[PDB]
Amino acid sequence: DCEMKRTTLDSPLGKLELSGCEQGLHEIIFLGGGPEPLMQATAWLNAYFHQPEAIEEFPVPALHHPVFQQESFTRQVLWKLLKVVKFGEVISYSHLAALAGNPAATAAVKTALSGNPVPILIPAHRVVQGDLDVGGYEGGLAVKEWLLAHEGHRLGKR
Numbered sequence: 001d002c003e004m005k006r007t008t009l010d011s012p013l014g015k016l017e018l019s020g021c022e023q024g025l026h027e028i029i030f031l032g033g034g035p036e037p038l039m040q041a042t043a044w045l046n047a048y049f050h051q052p053e054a055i056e057e058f059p060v061p062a063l064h065h066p067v068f069q070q071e072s073f074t075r076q077v078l079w080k081l082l083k084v085v086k087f088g089e090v091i092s093y094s095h096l097a098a099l100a101g102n103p104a105a106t107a108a109v110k111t112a113l114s115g116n117p118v119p120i121l122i123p124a125h126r127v128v129q130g131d132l133d134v135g136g137y138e139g140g141l142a143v144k145e146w147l148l149a150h151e152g153h154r155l156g157k158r
């Protein structure tokens with residue numbers, strides 16, 4: 001269900017395909033101006049890459065993937081990560097599990113993050129194993145560590 005529109009965007013990480021409906025952004029997928037969620041999402045991601053100093057000024061699009069439609073711990077993981085963990089910061093899986101309402105549920109957090117339908121925007125790349133261990137990522141570490149380097153973090157690697 002949902003009346004789905006798709007759109008594409010160039011990025012330093014290659015082509016990104018955004019998909020959405022009138023109620024919200026659904027997905028940001030790696031292909032390898034106004035109030036519509038898909039347009040707000042395009043502007044946000046373009047700012048992320050090209051005007052990162054202004055990123056907090058760009059509206060975050062409404063999200064309508066089915067994981068955001070119903071109450072769950074997975075929803076809490078993604079929502080709280082989005083709300084709390086800012087550009088240039090990281091948080092540990094363990095601390096994020098507690099923030100989401102289930103302390104110590106580190107493996108459940110990892111599973112939730114692997115299901116994130118809107119990477120970068122929901123910053124799964126900012127969730128690490130610990131102080132000296134950048135942890136895991138869908139498709140391997142290079143993109144995770146590139147994003148952290150873009151944000152100036154010690155754990156990043158260009």
Ligand SMILES: Nc1nc(OCc2ccccc2)c2nc[nH]c2n1
Nearest residue numbers: 110113114116119124127136137138
């Ligand atoms: N932080 C983190 N993030 C993951 O995937 C996020 C992601 C989802 C979709 C596309 C790209 C990246 C993880 N998978 C296992 N451990 C993880 N730890």
Ligand SMILES: [Zn+2]
Nearest residue numbers: 002021023064
């Ligand atoms: Zn929808």
